[PDB]
């Protein structure tokens, strides 16, 4: 969690900086437009309904997907539902790993390879 929260924090700060450009037409140098898109999607990621506590493992998976930008392609208006779908697939297909991430919290480099491979598989095969 400590190694993954920096990206979300800095993205939110950058988005908070570029505020009024949201109301105005966003046409601008790419960098600003890309920052605006990423800020919109990251603030959309924070939505969460009531009485549904997310675990550490799915939290890490979601934050890693956000930081790596696997959710850039998906339309913003459909992000949150997509989010849930991903967790579901990951929850059942890659369940043995989730017993380890939750119980230990270690970030041995391998945990990253498995998460990335699962994310690639879900993006390639399943549909939201």
């Amino acid at each position: 969690i400590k190694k993954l929260s920096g990206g979300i924090r800095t993205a939110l700060a950058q988005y908070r900086e570029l505020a009024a450009f949201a109301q105005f037409a966003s046409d601008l140098d790419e960098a600003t437009r890309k920052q605006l898109e990423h800020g919109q999607r990251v603030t959309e990621l924070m939505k969460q309904k009531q009485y549904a506590p997310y675990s550490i493992a799915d939290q890490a998976v979601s934050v890693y997907a956000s930081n790596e930008g696997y959710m850039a392609d998906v339309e913003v208006k459909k992000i949150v539902d997509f989010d849930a779908a991903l967790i579901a697939y990951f929850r059942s297909e890659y369940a043995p790993l989730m017993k380890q991430i939750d119980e230990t919290g270690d970030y041995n480099k391998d945990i990253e390879a498995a998460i990335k491979a699962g994310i690639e598989s879900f993006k390639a095969t399943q549909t939201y």
């Binding site: 505020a19 009024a20 450009f21 109301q23 105005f24 601008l28």
Partner: protein, 240 residues
């Protein structure tokens, strides 16, 4: 004097300041875009002036009427200004200079006609009065020349009958990002200067044209005038 009144005022001023700063950044970004566009046709008009220099070089015996002045009369002023407000004093300064120079001819009693391109220009000229023979609006940040061909075309058609004496063009000059000057110039008569290129090393054989060079310059001349007016209006847009 109520505390809530002051709180509301300060909140509103904070929001307004933020949006105005954002608009300043937007305007800063837009500034260069036009600077670049000017640099694009700048060589065009430059090579175009090189062309017009070659054009005047042609038909040494023949003389076009665009290079002489008839009794000074029928002054025509073309005004280019913003379609929106908040351009600082540029609009009001240009219009003040316009009216002061209008007194000049008005001093020797020279009849004054005007054409406008800006929306603030049309509002000012309607409030002042008079009759306008050409009015345009909503030209655009990068207007196609066709958007503006009608005004110059009808003006030149009117001058072709000899009714008018010459047209006194008005526009703003952009010196640096912080400094502009309301400038007034004269365009109808043309005089070459420092165009000695291709003259000290000119070919001995006479340039014979398969097309009739007697009329070849004519279209280029009108091409020259439309190119220069387009350059002026785009320069004014960039300065705005």
């Amino acid at each position: 004097a109520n505390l809530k009144e002051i709180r509301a005022k300060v909140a509103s001023i904070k929001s307004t300041q933020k949006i105005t700063r954002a608009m300043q950044m937007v305007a800063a970004s837009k500034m260069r875009r036009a600077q670049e566009r000017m640099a694009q046709g700048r060589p065009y008009a430059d090579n175009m002036r090189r062309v017009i220099a070659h054009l005047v070089q042609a038909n040494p015996e023949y003389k076009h009427r665009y290079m002489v002045d008839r009794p000074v009369k029928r002054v025509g002023y073309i005004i280019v200004s913003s379609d929106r407000g908040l351009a600082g004093g540029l609009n009001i300064n240009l219009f003040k200079k316009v009216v002061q120079h209008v007194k000049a001819q008005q001093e020797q009693s020279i009849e004054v006609q005007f054409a406008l391109i800006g929306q603030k220009a049309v509002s000012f000229f309607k409030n002042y009065g008079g009759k306008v023979l050409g009015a345009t609006t909503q030209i655009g940040d990068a207007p196609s020349l066709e958007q503006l061909t009608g005004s110059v075309q009808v003006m030149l058609d009117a001058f072709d009958k000899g009714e008018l004496d010459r047209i006194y063009l008005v526009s703003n000059g952009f010196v640096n990002a912080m400094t502009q000057k309301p400038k007034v110039e004269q365009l109808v008569p043309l005089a070459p200067a420092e165009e000695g290129d291709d003259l000290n090393r000119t070919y001995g054989w006479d340039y014979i044209y398969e097309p009739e060079a007697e009329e070849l310059l004519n279209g280029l001349l009108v091409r020259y005038i439309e190119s220069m007016v387009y350059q002026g209006v785009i320069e004014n847009v960039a300065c705005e």
